[PDB]
Design a protein around this motif. Structure first.
Motif, PDB file in Angstrom:
ATOM      1  N   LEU A   1       0.841  -1.187   0.000  1.00  0.00           N
ATOM      2  CA  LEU A   1       0.000   0.000   0.000  1.00  0.00           C
ATOM      3  C   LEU A   1       0.885   1.249   0.000  1.00  0.00           C
ATOM      4  N   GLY A   2       0.477   2.248  -0.773  1.00  0.00           N
ATOM      5  CA  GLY A   2       1.261   3.465  -0.877  1.00  0.00           C
ATOM      6  C   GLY A   2       2.072   3.475  -2.155  1.00  0.00           C
ATOM      7  N   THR A   3       2.045   2.361  -2.883  1.00  0.00           N
ATOM      8  CA  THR A   3       2.651   2.340  -4.195  1.00  0.00           C
ATOM      9  C   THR A   3       1.556   2.073  -5.200  1.00  0.00           C
ATOM     10  N   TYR A   4       1.906   2.096  -6.469  1.00  0.00           N
ATOM     11  CA  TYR A   4       1.000   1.551  -7.462  1.00  0.00           C
ATOM     12  C   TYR A   4       1.819   0.923  -8.571  1.00  0.00           C
ATOM     13  N   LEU A   5       1.153   0.132  -9.403  1.00  0.00           N
ATOM     14  CA  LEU A   5       1.851  -0.643 -10.416  1.00  0.00           C
ATOM     15  C   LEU A   5       1.585  -0.084 -11.803  1.00  0.00           C
ATOM     16  N   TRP A   6       2.603  -0.121 -12.653  1.00  0.00           N
ATOM     17  CA  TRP A   6       2.358   0.011 -14.073  1.00  0.00           C
ATOM     18  C   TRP A   6       2.625  -1.364 -14.661  1.00  0.00           C
ATOM     19  N   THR A   7       1.694  -1.814 -15.488  1.00  0.00           N
ATOM     20  CA  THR A   7       1.708  -3.183 -15.955  1.00  0.00           C
ATOM     21  C   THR A   7       1.703  -3.279 -17.474  1.00  0.00           C
ATOM     22  N   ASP A   8       2.756  -3.880 -18.014  1.00  0.00           N
ATOM     23  CA  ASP A   8       2.858  -4.134 -19.444  1.00  0.00           C
ATOM     24  C   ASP A   8       2.020  -5.378 -19.767  1.00  0.00           C
ATOM     25  N   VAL A   9       1.004  -5.202 -20.611  1.00  0.00           N
ATOM     26  CA  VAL A   9       0.210  -6.336 -21.098  1.00  0.00           C
ATOM     27  C   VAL A   9       0.595  -6.813 -22.497  1.00  0.00           C
ATOM     28  N   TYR A  10       1.510  -6.083 -23.126  1.00  0.00           N
ATOM     29  CA  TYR A  10       1.881  -6.291 -24.517  1.00  0.00           C
ATOM     30  C   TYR A  10       2.846  -7.466 -24.691  1.00  0.00           C
ATOM     31  N   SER A  11       3.824  -7.591 -23.794  1.00  0.00           N
ATOM     32  CA  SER A  11       4.839  -8.636 -23.914  1.00  0.00           C
ATOM     33  C   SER A  11       4.256 -10.040 -23.732  1.00  0.00           C
ATOM     34  N   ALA A  12       3.184 -10.135 -22.959  1.00  0.00           N
ATOM     35  CA  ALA A  12       2.563 -11.417 -22.664  1.00  0.00           C
ATOM     36  C   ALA A  12       1.600 -11.856 -23.762  1.00  0.00           C
ATOM     37  N   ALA A  13       1.287 -10.942 -24.675  1.00  0.00           N
ATOM     38  CA  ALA A  13       0.340 -11.241 -25.747  1.00  0.00           C
ATOM     39  C   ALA A  13       0.988 -12.208 -26.723  1.00  0.00           C
ATOM     40  N   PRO A  14       0.240 -13.232 -27.159  1.00  0.00           N
ATOM     41  CA  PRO A  14       0.783 -14.141 -28.172  1.00  0.00           C
ATOM     42  C   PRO A  14       1.067 -13.395 -29.463  1.00  0.00           C
ATOM     43  N   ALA A  15       1.962 -13.934 -30.286  1.00  0.00           N
ATOM     44  CA  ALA A  15       2.266 -13.304 -31.560  1.00  0.00           C
ATOM     45  C   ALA A  15       1.013 -13.246 -32.412  1.00  0.00           C
ATOM     46  N   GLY A  16       0.798 -12.109 -33.060  1.00  0.00           N
ATOM     47  CA  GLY A  16      -0.323 -11.968 -33.965  1.00  0.00           C
ATOM     48  C   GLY A  16      -1.600 -11.517 -33.285  1.00  0.00           C
ATOM     49  N   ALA A  17      -1.600 -11.475 -31.956  1.00  0.00           N
ATOM     50  CA  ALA A  17      -2.777 -10.989 -31.258  1.00  0.00           C
ATOM     51  C   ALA A  17      -2.989  -9.526 -31.622  1.00  0.00           C
ATOM     52  N   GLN A  18      -4.252  -9.149 -31.730  1.00  0.00           N
ATOM     53  CA  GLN A  18      -4.659  -7.817 -32.155  1.00  0.00           C
ATOM     54  C   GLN A  18      -5.020  -6.917 -30.980  1.00  0.00           C
ATOM     55  N   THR A  19      -6.001  -7.362 -30.201  1.00  0.00           N
ATOM     56  CA  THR A  19      -6.596  -6.558 -29.143  1.00  0.00           C
ATOM     57  C   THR A  19      -6.585  -7.286 -27.797  1.00  0.00           C
ATOM     58  N   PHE A  20      -6.872  -6.549 -26.727  1.00  0.00           N
ATOM     59  CA  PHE A  20      -7.020  -7.166 -25.411  1.00  0.00           C
ATOM     60  C   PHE A  20      -8.229  -6.615 -24.676  1.00  0.00           C
ATOM     61  N   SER A  21      -8.731  -7.391 -23.719  1.00  0.00           N
ATOM     62  CA  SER A  21      -9.797  -6.949 -22.827  1.00  0.00           C
ATOM     63  C   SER A  21      -9.336  -7.306 -21.426  1.00  0.00           C
ATOM     64  N   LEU A  22     -10.022  -6.800 -20.410  1.00  0.00           N
ATOM     65  CA  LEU A  22      -9.615  -7.133 -19.052  1.00  0.00           C
ATOM     66  C   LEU A  22     -10.776  -7.236 -18.091  1.00  0.00           C
ATOM     67  N   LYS A  23     -10.572  -8.040 -17.057  1.00  0.00           N
ATOM     68  CA  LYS A  23     -11.488  -8.099 -15.929  1.00  0.00           C
ATOM     69  C   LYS A  23     -10.670  -7.867 -14.668  1.00  0.00           C
TER      70      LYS A  23
END
Ligand SMILES: [Ca+2]
Ligand SMILES: [Ca+2]
Ligand SMILES: [Ca+2]
Ligand SMILES: [Ca+2]
Ligand SMILES: [Ca+2]
Ligand SMILES: [Ca+2]
Ligand SMILES: [Ca+2]
Ligand SMILES: [Ca+2]
Ligand SMILES: [Ca+2]
Ligand SMILES: [Ca+2]
Lengths: 655, 655
Positions: free
Chosen positions: B19-41
C-alpha cells in the motif's frame, strides 16, 4: 570592531590603529591617585568621544572642558584615514586634583593609522574587489558569495611527469592563469612603528590543500616564490609605505573528499613584539576563505567536442564507420591503436569564475595509471584504495551521469551521477569506497546507486543510456529490454522467419547455426531472460524515482543475455544501448540480428523506435574483425563534452 | 511510488502489492504473436486504468471493452486496502486475434496487498505517529522534523562497571525509558505469499552507533532481544497477520564527533526469493532516520540543582561557609573528602522529546578516569587522545560556556562554549584535538577559543566568569583586572594606608610582611602586570566580538599576578572571578587583601561593585587551613544546573 587600548599611568602609549576598527580607551587607570577631573586634546584626524556610562559626546581638538574621573567614563577613539609622514595623530589627557586648574599629570596616546585588507574575488566576477565584507564566508547560490579555487591539476610543460600541484614550484607564467588572485592592500606611512610586523599564515591542516605564490621581477627575470603551502605555514611580509598592493596567486592541491569539505582559509595578521621569549601578539587579523571547485561529469546530452577511440589498427570497418559518423558532426576524432578508453577514464571538468579546464578521473588499478593525457589545461586526478580490493565495478563503464532533472521539486541542474552496485544484504560487488566517497564529496552531482551486479561485467553502461530529443530541451532514458527482444522474435517467427540466422558474416559463429527458432525453443534461456528483465525493471523503478521520470520518458531497446556460472548476465548479442551520442547522431553497436528480407530485424526495429524522433542512427561494427561475438566488446570510445552552461556555484545542495 | 510489474507470456504472475505504491503493468509482452486486441477483468478492490500513450481511463470490473495491443498501451493498477482471507484480488487480461471474439490466450495478475510502515516519533512529541512522510529526513528548527535518539550512557544497575550502551544486552525494563520507540506496523492476510520475507537492517557503519531491542513476554518473564547493532546487521521479522504492530526500542551508542554527523538510519524491506544462490530482491523498502542528541553544557545563569564540593576533611572554614552559602538557596550540597571536581569533570546534559538526563564529561588522563558518578539517569562520556599528549589546558577549569547571546543578528540560544588556547603562531599549549573535535561536533554550542596560555595553569576560569543581573533576563561578564588592583592600591596608599598588610591571619606568610607600599614599589612586578592586563584586554576584545557584548555588559574585578620562568602568570592573591554562582548569591574566594579599618579593601571594593546590582556576596576562605597562599587553589566546587528550557532541536546551526 571595538578594540581595547588603555592609557598608561604616568607614561605615553604608542599604538597602531587599523582602519575599520575603533578604540575604547580607559583614562581612569592612568590618573594619579587623588586626581579629580580630566581634560583632553586631540589632533585633526583623530575623532574623540567622551562616553559616560554609555552616553557619547564628541570633543573638540583643543577644548578646556573637564569631566569627573570615573571608571565608567571612557574615551572612544576613531580614525577614518591612514597616517602619512605629515601626520601627528594623537590624543592627550590632562589630570587635575581637587584644587587648582593646572594639570598635575598627563597621559597620552600616539597613533599611527594604517589600512590592511586581504582581498579576493568573493563576488565571483573574476576581478578582486576592495574588501568584500562577505570574503570571510562561503555561501551557495545565485546570491551567494566567496572566492573559488581550482585544483591546479593540469601540467604546463612536458619536461616533468607530474601535475603542477604536486610540488612547491612554478616554472611558467602560464601556470598563474590557473590560480586565484589574492591581494594584500595596505596604506600607511613610510614604515610600520617599531615592534610591528605583518604576517600571512595558514593552518597545518590546510598546508596540504593550498599553495600561495608571489611574483618578483628581479634583474634576470620573473620568478615565483612559494610563500605558503606544504611545510610553510607563515610568511613575514615586507611592508611598503604609501598606498601599496601585493599580488599573490593561490592554487588548490586537493579535491573535496571524505573528511575535506573543500573550504580553506588564509589569514593576515598585524603582530606586536612584546619581549624576548614572549610570543608576538595578533593586534589585527583579516581572513579570506576559498572553496575548492568540485570535479564535475558530463551527460550525453551535452555538446560533443572530441571523440576518443581505441581499437586495433586493423579493425577497418569500425574505424571507417566511426570516422563517417564523426564527419556528420563538428567533433574531432582522436584514435589510439582495447576497452581501456571507456573503462579507465572519465572526462570531467572544473570551473572557477576566472578559468576552467577538462580533468580526467583515472580508474583505480592495470598495474599502471594512464597519465599520458595530462597536459596544458587538461588535468588529472585519481583515487586508489589503501586496503579494499578493486573489482569490475570500479571500471568507469560503471560510472555515468544523468541529464539535469527535477525530483519532487528539487532541481539537479548538473544531473546526478549513476554508479552500479549490488543489493545491501547481498554480499555482492560494489565500487570501492575511496571512489564512491570522492564522487559523493563533489556534492553537486548527488550520486545514485543502481543495481548492476546481476551482470557479469557489472556496469551501468551495459543496460541504460540517455539521448536528447532533437529540437527540444528534453531527453529520453533508453533501457535494455529482454521482453522487447522476445516479443520481436516471436512476431518474426509467426511471420515465417523462424529459420532466420543470426551472426551472419561472422564465420567463427557459423557452425552454431543460431536461428530465431533455436533461441525461442531454449527453455532455460527463456527463464534466464525473464529473470534479467526483473533486474532491468528494478533499475527502471530506481531511475524513475531518483530522476523524476515517467514512462513517457523511456524507450526500451531489444536485448538478450546468457547466464554464467555465478547467475550473472553477459550479452548474447552486442548491447545496443551503449552507444555513441553526438547530438542527433547515434553510433549504435551493430547487433548482428536475424536477417529478414536482407536487413537485420534488430536494426530495423531500433530505427523504427528512434528515427521518428529525429534521431539519426548509424550501426557500427566492432566485431567483424574478430569473426565472432562471445559477449566481450573489444573497442572503446569516450566522448569529451562541453561543460554545462549553469555555474556549479549557483546550485544550492542539501545540507 | 510507481513500481513495474509485467504480465508474463502465457502464464500468471503472483505479486505482493505494498500500500502506498501503485503498479504500471505491461500487457503487450505477454500477448501471443499476432494478437490484435485485449480486454480485461478485475476484482472489486483492485482499481485498473488503461493508459494509452499517457492518457488514463478507469475500467470496470467486468467489461467487454477491447483496446488495440500496443507497447504504449499499458495498465495502471492501484489498491487502497490490504488483502484479507476473504480476498481474491486479481486482474485478468484476455487476448484476441484479428478474426473472432473468443479469447485466444489470457494472462493474469494475482495480488496480495499488505501495509508495511516503519514508524518513529518524527514530529517530536514523544508518541509514534502513523507513517510520517518526513520520517526519512532530519531538519532543524521549530518547523523541523525527524526522530531523536539519546546515547544511552547512564547505568541502570550498580552490579556492572560499564555504561549501558557498552554491551548488546538489556537487564532492566527501566533501560527502555532511555530509548526511542520504533514500531513496525503491518496489515495483511494470515501469512505472506510463498517466497517473501520482511527484514530489518542497518549499515555496517551504523552498527557501532545504535542498538535495537525487541521485548518478548515468554512464560518465565519479560526478556529483551538485541536485533540490530554491533555484529548484527539484519533481522528477519516474524510476520503476524491482520493488523499488527511490533514495538522496538532504539539506543544510541556514540555521540556526534569528528567524522560522525550524528545521523543514523534503520530500514525495513520486503524481500522476494528468486532462486538458490541468487540474492533476495528488495521489493519495497521503508526508512527512518534518527539524530543522536548532542552533549550540552550549562552556563552560570541557569538554576543550580546540586553543589558538588571536594576538600580535605579538616578545612572547616571552607565547609562551614559553603554550607552557609548553600543554605541560602534550595540546592543540595554534596561533599567528597583536591581540585579534581572542577578540573576533571564537566556536568552537561542530553535531551530527547521523551526523556533527558545529566551527563558527565570526564577530562582525559590522572592515570584513571572518574567513573563513580555513573548511575541511573546520570551518564558518562570521555575522550582520550591516541597520540597527542595532555596538558593543563585539557583540564575542565579550561572549559566553560556563555549565557545565551545574539551576535551580529545570529542567536545562540544555548550560549557558546569557551576554551582557552594560545596564539596560532605561538607554538604554545592548546586543548587536545580529540576534545576540541568532540565539542565542535555537538554543534549547538558553537565553541570559541580564548587566550589562556599566558597563565601558568592556563584556564579560562582563572580570568573570567558570568553572573546574572537579579530581577532581569540579563547578565554580566566579570573580568580579572590588574589595572583595577593597582588603581585601588594607589588610592589606599595616597590615603595613608601604604603600610596595610596583606595575607593577615596566614601565619606562613607573615615573615614576608607584604604591604601595599612593598607591592607598589616593586618595579618588575608593575611591568609584569601591565603585560598581563594586555593579555586580559585581548580576551576582553574576543569576548565582546564573539558574544556580542559592549562595555555596559562588563565589570572588572581587581586581580594581581606574578610571572614565572616561562613568562606566564600565577595568582598573587586568590582569583575572585572564579566564584560559585547560585542565582543572586555569589561565593567569592577570600582574597586576603590589605586591611583598612579592619576590613579587607578588596572585599569592600568588590561588594561596592556587585551589591548595587542585587548580588549578594559571601567570601569563602579555602586557604586558611594551609596557612599560606602560593598561587594554588586547593579545594574545588562544581555546580550541576537545570537544563535550558529552549529545546536544542529548535536551533538552526550554520551549515
Ligand atoms: Ca570580484
Ligand atoms: Ca607547481
Ligand atoms: Ca597549471
Ligand atoms: Ca593551465
Ligand atoms: Ca563512463
Ligand atoms: Ca509523534
Ligand atoms: Ca546494555
Ligand atoms: Ca540506561
Ligand atoms: Ca536511565
Ligand atoms: Ca569548567
Amino acid at each position: 570592531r571595538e578594540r581595547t587600548v588603555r592609557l598608561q599611568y604616568g607614561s605615553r602609549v604608542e599604538a597602531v590603529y587599523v582602519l575599520g576598527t575603533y578604540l575604547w580607551t580607559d583614562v581612569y587607570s592612568a590618573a594619579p591617585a587623588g586626581a579629580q577631573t580630566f581634560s583632553l586634546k586631540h589632533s585633526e584626524h583623530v575623532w574623540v568621544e567622551v562616553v559616560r556610562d554609555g552616553e557619547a559626546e564628541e570633543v573638540a581638538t583643543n577644548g578646556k572642558q573637564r569631566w569627573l574621573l570615573s571608571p565608567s567614563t571612557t574615551l572612544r577613539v576613531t580614525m577614518s584615514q591612514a597616517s602619512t609622514e605629515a601626520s601627528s595623530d594623537k590624543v592627550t589627557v590632562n589630570y587635575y586634583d581637587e584644587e587648582g586648574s593646572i594639570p598635575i599629570d598627563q597621559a597620552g596616546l600616539f597613533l599611527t593609522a594604517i589600512e590592511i585588507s586581504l582581498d579576493v574575488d568573493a563576488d565571483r566576477d573574476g576581478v578582486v574587489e576592495k574588501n568584500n565584507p562577505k570574503k570571510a564566508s562561503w555561501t551557495w547560490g545565485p546570491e551567494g558569495q566567496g572566492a573559488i579555487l581550482l585544483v591546479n591539476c593540469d601540467r604546463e610543460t612536458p619536461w616533468l611527469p607530474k601535475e603542477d600541484c604536486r610540488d612547491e614550484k612554478v616554472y611558467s607564467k602560464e601556470d598563474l592563469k590557473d590560480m586565484s588572485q589574492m591581494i594584500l592592500r595596505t596604506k600607511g606611512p613610510d614604515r610600520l612603528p617599531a615592534g610591528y610586523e605583518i604576517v600571512l599564515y595558514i593552518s597545518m591542516s590546510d598546508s596540504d590543500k593550498v599553495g600561495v605564490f608571489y611574483v618578483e621581477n628581479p634583474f634576470f627575470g620573473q620568478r615565483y616564490i612559494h610563500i605558503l603551502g606544504r611545510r610553510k605555514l607563515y610568511h613575514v611580509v615586507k611592508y611598503t609605505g604609501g598606498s601599496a598592493e601585493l599580488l599573490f596567486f593561490v592554487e588548490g592541491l586537493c579535491f573535496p573528499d571524505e573528511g575535506f569539505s573543500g573550504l580553506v582559509s588564509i589569514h593576515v595578521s598585524l603582530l606586536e613584539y612584546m619581549a624576548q621569549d614572549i610570543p608576538l601578539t595578533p593586534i589585527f587579523t583579516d581572513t579570506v576563505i576559498f572553496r575548492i571547485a568540485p570535479w564535475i561529469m558530463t551527460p550525453n546530452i551535452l555538446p560533443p567536442v572530441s571523440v576518443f577511440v581505441c581499437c586495433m589498427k586493423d579493425n577497418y570497418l569500425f574505424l571507417k564507420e566511426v570516422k563517417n559518423l564523426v564527419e556528420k558532426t563538428n567533433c574531432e576524432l582522436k584514435v589510439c591503436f582495447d576497452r581501456w578508453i571507456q573503462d579507465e577514464i572519465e572526462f570531467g571538468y572544473i570551473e572557477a569564475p576566472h578559468k576552467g579546464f577538462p580533468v580526467v578521473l583515472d580508474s583505480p588499478r592495470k598495474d599502471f595509471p594512464v597519465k599520458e593525457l595530462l597536459g596544458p589545461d587538461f588535468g588529472y586526478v585519481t583515487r586508489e584504495p589503501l586496503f579494499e580490493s578493486v573489482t569490475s565495478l570500479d571500471s568507469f563503464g560503471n560510472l555515468e551521469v544523468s541529464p539535469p532533472v527535477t525530483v519532487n521539486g528539487k532541481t539537479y541542474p548538473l544531473g546526478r551521477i549513476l554508479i552500479g552496485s549490488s543489493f545491501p544484504l547481498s554480499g555482492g560487488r560494489r565500487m570501492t569506497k575511496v571512489v564512491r566517497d570522492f564522487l559523493k564529496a563533489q556534492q553537486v552531482q548527488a550520486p545514485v546507486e543502481l543495481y548492476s551486479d546481476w551482470l557479469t561485467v557489472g556496469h551501468v553502461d551495459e543496460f541504460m543510456s540517455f539521448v536528447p530529443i532533437p529540437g527540444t530541451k528534453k531527453f529520453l532514458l533508453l533501457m535494455a529490454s529482454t521482453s522487447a527482444c522476445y516479443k520481436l522474435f516471436r512476431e518474426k517467427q509467426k511471420d515465417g522467419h523462424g529459420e532466420a540466422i543470426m551472426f551472419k558474416g561472422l564465420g567463427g559463429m557459423s557452425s552454431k547455426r543460431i536461428t530465431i527458432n533455436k533461441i525461442l525453443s531454449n527453455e532455460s534461456l527463456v527463464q534466464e531472460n525473464l529473470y534479467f528483465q526483473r533486474c532491468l525493471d528494478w533499475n527502471r523503478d530506481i531511475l524513475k524515482k531518483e530522476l523524476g521520470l515517467t514512462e513517457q520518458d523511456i524507450i526500451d531497446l531489444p536485448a538478450l543475455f546468457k547466464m554464467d556460472e555465478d547467475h550473472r548476465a553477459r550479452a548474447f548479442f552486442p548491447n545496443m544501448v551503449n552507444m555513441i551520442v553526438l547530438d542527433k547522431d547515434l553510433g549504435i553497436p551493430k547487433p548482428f540480428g536475424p536477417q529478414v528480407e536482407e536487413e537485420c530485424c534488430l536494426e530495423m526495429h531500433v530505427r523504427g523506435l528512434l528515427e521518428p524522433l529525429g534521431l539519426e542512427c548509424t550501426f557500427i561494427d566492432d566485431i567483424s574483425a574478430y569473426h565472432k561475438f562471445l559477449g566481450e566488446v573489444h573497442c572503446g570510445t569516450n566522448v569529451r563534452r562541453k561543460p554545462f552552461t549553469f555555474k556549479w556555484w549557483h546550485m544550492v545542495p542539501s545540507r
